[PDB]
Amino acid sequence: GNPLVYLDVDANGKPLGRVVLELKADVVPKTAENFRALCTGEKGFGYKGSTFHRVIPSFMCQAGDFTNHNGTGGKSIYGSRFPDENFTLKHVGPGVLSMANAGPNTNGSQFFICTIKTDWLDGKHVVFGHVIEGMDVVKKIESFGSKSGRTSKKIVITDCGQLS
Ligand SMILES: CCOC(=O)CNC(=O)NCc1ccccc1
Ligand SMILES: [K+]
Ligand SMILES: [K+]
């Protein structure tokens, strides 16, 4: 089956809770596998100890720049970047998990969780999963963002991994 993975998140060292994600390996295997492995840390690098660096209320929460911590960086388990796999899944509502990019075929490690329907991203960002549990936790992260994207507390993925 599809992987089920988790992110345990804190704000200034205080736990907010767990976000559980399904990864749609049946539709985007290569994209789902990248994320899965960055959660477990099995390649020697990954999301543990990195931040949500760009959080815009009524839009999305963005994370995954584990090299530069600011939106410039990240890397995939394949190499620095990898192709757009396909655009079959759409940005249908809150809870969609999608790849951030710098244009076509520039996927690395950065990702976002939507807090609204972001359909203007369809055909431009590769959707690869969704939130199974913990949308309340995502709304807590969202509360610490601002319209500029800058966060008011440091929001850290303190642990992550695979449940099944
Ligand atoms: C809601 C999604 O917005 C984005 O993807 C906007 N673009 C980013 O923040 N891109 C930073 C980036 C993403 C992957 C590779 C290098 C840089
Ligand atoms: K806007
Ligand atoms: K772990």
UniProtKB/Swiss-Prot annotation:
Main location: mitochondrion
Catalytic activity: [protein]-peptidylproline (omega=180) = [protein]-peptidylproline (omega=0)
Swiss-Prot/TrEMBL keywords: Acetylation, Apoptosis, Isomerase, Mitochondrion, Necrosis, Rotamase, S-nitrosylation, Transit peptide
Function: PPIase that catalyzes the cis-trans isomerization of proline imidic peptide bonds in oligopeptides and may therefore assist protein folding. Involved in regulation of the mitochondrial permeability transition pore (mPTP). It is proposed that its association with the mPTP is masking a binding site for inhibiting inorganic phosphate (Pi) and promotes the open probability of the mPTP leading to apoptosis or necrosis; the requirement of the PPIase activity for this function is debated. In cooperation with mitochondrial p53/TP53 is involved in activating oxidative stress-induced necrosis.
GO cellular component: cytoplasm; membrane; mitochondrial matrix; mitochondrial permeability transition pore complex; mitochondrion
Organism expressing this protein natively: Homo sapiens (Human)
Residue intervals of the PPIase cyclophilin-type domain: 6-162
Subcellular compartments: Mitochondrion matrix
Modified how: Acetylated at Lys-124; deacetylated at Lys-124 by SIRT3.
Residues of the full protein shown: 44 to 207 of 207
GO terms, biological process: apoptotic mitochondrial changes; cellular response to arsenic-containing substance; cellular response to calcium ion; cellular response to hydrogen peroxide; mitochondrial depolarization; mitochondrial outer membrane permeabilization involved in programmed cell death; necroptotic process; negative regulation of apoptotic process
Modified residue annotations for N6-succinyllysine: 24, 43, 132, 147
Lineage of the species this protein comes from: Eukaryota, Metazoa, Chordata, Craniata, Vertebrata
Enzyme Commission designation: 5.2.1.8
Activity regulation information from UniProt: Inhibited by cyclosporin A (CsA). Is displaced by CsA from the mPTP leading to a lower open probability of the mPTP.
UniProt-recorded name of the protein: Peptidyl-prolyl cis-trans isomerase F, mitochondrial
Effect of residue 160 to S: Blocks Ca(2+)-induced mPTP opening and reduces hydrogen peroxide-induced cell death
